[PDB]
Amino acid sequence: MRITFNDVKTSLGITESYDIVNAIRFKSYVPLATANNVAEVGAGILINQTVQNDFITSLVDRIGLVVIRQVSLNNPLKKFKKGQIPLGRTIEEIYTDITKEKQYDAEEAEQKVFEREMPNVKTLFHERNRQGFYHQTIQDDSLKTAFVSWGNFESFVSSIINAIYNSAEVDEYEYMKLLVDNYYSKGLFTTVKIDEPTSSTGALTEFVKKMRATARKLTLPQGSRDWNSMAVRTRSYMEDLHLIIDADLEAELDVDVLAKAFNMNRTDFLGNVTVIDGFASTGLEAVLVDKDWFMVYDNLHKMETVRNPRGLYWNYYYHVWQTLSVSRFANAVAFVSGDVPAVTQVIVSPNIAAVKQGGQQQFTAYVRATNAKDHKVVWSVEGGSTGTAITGDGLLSVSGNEDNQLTVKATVDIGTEDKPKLVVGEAVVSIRPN
Amino acid sequence: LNKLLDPELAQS
Amino acid sequence: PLKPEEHEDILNKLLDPELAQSERTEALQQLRVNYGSFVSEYNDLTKSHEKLAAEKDDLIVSNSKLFRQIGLT
Amino acid sequence: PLKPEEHEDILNKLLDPELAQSERTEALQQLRVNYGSFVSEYNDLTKSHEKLAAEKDDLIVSNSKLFRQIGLT
């Protein structure tokens, strides 16, 4: 974040370390020597335009890429930072339900041995694309005045690298914040209600208690299924939970207390909680996230330089291309402090089904209610045909001679005498003929 | 690529 | 490092009394580096010519001592 | 045999395009005669290195068998 030349990721020591790109090309005017001569190498490089251009392009491109890439891989954001995108991604999640185990029955087993498991529910990824360049500049006098000694070259290279990479770190942090904002905006976070932690000390203590309760309930050994984008019954270990807390909020709470909410001690937390000032999404305060939830992949990291003969200067272009993916099966909590409605969003089990012309499918709805009250779900079919009817329990029955595609709809009402408030979940059902 | 891709005959 | 033949072609190139000011400095600096690497080679090889000669005498002395020691057993 | 500092003077002398063709001819001559001398002095001591180095290798191989017999007893 404040890189100096002493951060030597690769190669041996001493400034004379690089000074060899002449081998790969050139090495007829620069002395291939490792000594105290600094004027000779400067004169050899500075002879003409061709030698200048070759040396500058090589040093800027290859060493710059190596240095910044090997420095940006150990930033405090390395936890969610993975390598190059794999081939054959298929842009699809595949998670299997943690079901129970059948009882051993010889009579039942002898009846059928070719049965298959339930569908795994294959939902797509949530991704965002990142593209940009930073575009710094080199003046000609810098090369002239950077060869007086063996430390000026160090200062010049380190100045370039530090001038570029610091802005990239800030953009990475801002992109993480923007992704969290967008995910909350689409409403897939499971909200937990808190009220004005910064207002009073009692509010802060109550927020800490709710923090601890949610973190303890997320890490239940037998699974939860409550906190998810869809009911899948996963389980998250305590050592993987990540906390994204607003800066002014985090300032008030001590490092402790919030530390003892989880089960490790202080030092093991500074790499498990990031601080971002301002969410700008109604009343978002803090977000509790499984380490798997956020995943970033990188595609392109390339330098190219251009030379302007009229102005005697060179340019810069770091092209950083990334695909920030969001998983929909990892646990996620919103922890919003506002006036959110009683029911945020309902989720329909078997979202995708392939029912025959005479079969049936059982659907269940999971209401995500912020209060302790009970809400009833009214099922509907939409679609449009004769003979297709769904029961009050969600059991859909398909009649013969049908060709349209049905969309099971689950609706809840949290309104009043006037009802401009509908929370609806959709399940797309495809039909196959017999 | 690493640093080694640019060979150094002046290493020793 | 440059062969006397290749060093010769540099000489007549600089012999030209009309010549562009660009390569006239380029070839002039080329001879500067050619000589600079050649002298260091001479010091480096002379430094090898004394230690190796001194080591050669020591190896001869060690060979004579080792032969005698084997004969004593 | 030319020192790097003194040999720089001729290179600096050969920088002026206005210099008389006679002076450039003589100045270029000193580079040829001494480089021919420099490679000549380089050659014999390089070849003489190839002679005593082989003697050292012969002594090293011969001695290496001799240390083996010392450890036998």
Side-chain angles (χ1 to χ4, degrees), chain A residues 350-364:
Chain A
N351 58 320
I352 302 311
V355 177
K356 295 175 178 179
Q357 306 204 137
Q360 291 178 335
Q361 185 56 223
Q362 180 68 105
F363 295 94
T364 36

Side-chain angles (χ1 to χ4, degrees), chain C:
Chain C
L2 204 68
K3 202 73 41 173
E5 186 39 50
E6 304 139 5
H7 178 276
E8 200 270 349
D9 309 25
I10 300 321
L11 276 166
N12 39 312
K13 188 193 151 317
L14 251 173
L15 173 88
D16 277 14
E18 51 275 60
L19 209 49
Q21 301 88 338
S22 65
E23 63 285 42
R24 182 113 187 291
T25 43
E26 182 256 0
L28 209 35
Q29 167 92 12
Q30 155 153 338
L31 267 173
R32 215 186 314 295
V33 179
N34 185 2
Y35 203 33
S37 160
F38 206 45
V39 278
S40 96
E41 167 59 31
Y42 203 119
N43 301 57
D44 288 327
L45 172 153
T46 44
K47 287 327 282 163
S48 285
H49 210 60
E50 327 314 298
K51 324 322 161 203
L52 208 166
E55 164 164 41
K56 187 253 188 178
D57 320 315
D58 300 326
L59 290 177
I60 289 173
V61 173
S62 93
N63 175 274
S64 287
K65 295 185 172 180
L66 258 45
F67 261 97
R68 175 159 283 132
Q69 174 130 42
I70 299 176
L72 299 181
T73 311

Side-chain angles (χ1 to χ4, degrees), chain A residues 134-242:
Chain A
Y134 296 81
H135 172 239
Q136 208 51 33
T137 308
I138 289 189
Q139 273 155 32
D140 192 294
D141 265 336
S142 322
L143 202 68
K144 239 177 175 194
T145 60
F147 261 120
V148 315
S149 98
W150 272 128
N152 274 47
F153 184 82
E154 311 211 7
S155 168
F156 155 76
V157 176
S158 99
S159 97
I160 297 178
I161 288 329
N162 154 84
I164 274 166
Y165 146 78
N166 303 343
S167 65
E169 183 178 2
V170 172
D171 272 340
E172 260 183 357
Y173 271 95
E174 180 275 339
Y175 254 84
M176 191 205 318
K177 153 180 159 311
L178 169 148
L179 219 41
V180 160
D181 263 348
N182 177 30
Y183 209 60
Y184 175 91
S185 70
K186 285 181 180 178
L188 299 173
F189 279 106
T190 301
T191 67
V192 170
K193 279 286 293 312
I194 68 132
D195 302 314
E196 292 178 2
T198 47
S199 69
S200 59
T201 74
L204 264 184
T205 291
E206 171 285 347
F207 173 80
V208 153
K209 284 322 320 173
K210 189 129 41 165
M211 191 46 38
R212 168 133 160 89
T214 289
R216 186 159 51 151
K217 155 43 181 193
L218 280 171
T219 307
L220 210 68
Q222 328 168 41
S224 53
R225 171 188 291 254
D226 227 328
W227 324 99
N228 253 353
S229 184
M230 31 175 78
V232 189
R233 172 185 196 42
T234 36
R235 47 203 263 191
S236 208
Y237 309 86
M238 171 85 48
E239 28 172 25
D240 290 347
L241 293 210
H242 199 246

Side-chain angles (χ1 to χ4, degrees), chain A residues 75 100 177 250 289 337 385:
Chain A
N75 37 24
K100 293 178 179 179
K177 153 180 159 311
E250 151 66 1
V289 158
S337 75
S385 64

Side-chain angles (χ1 to χ4, degrees), chain B:
Chain B
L1 184 134
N2 315 65
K3 182 79 215 88
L4 170 72
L5 200 141
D6 316 66
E8 324 170 54
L9 290 210
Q11 226 159 22
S12 36

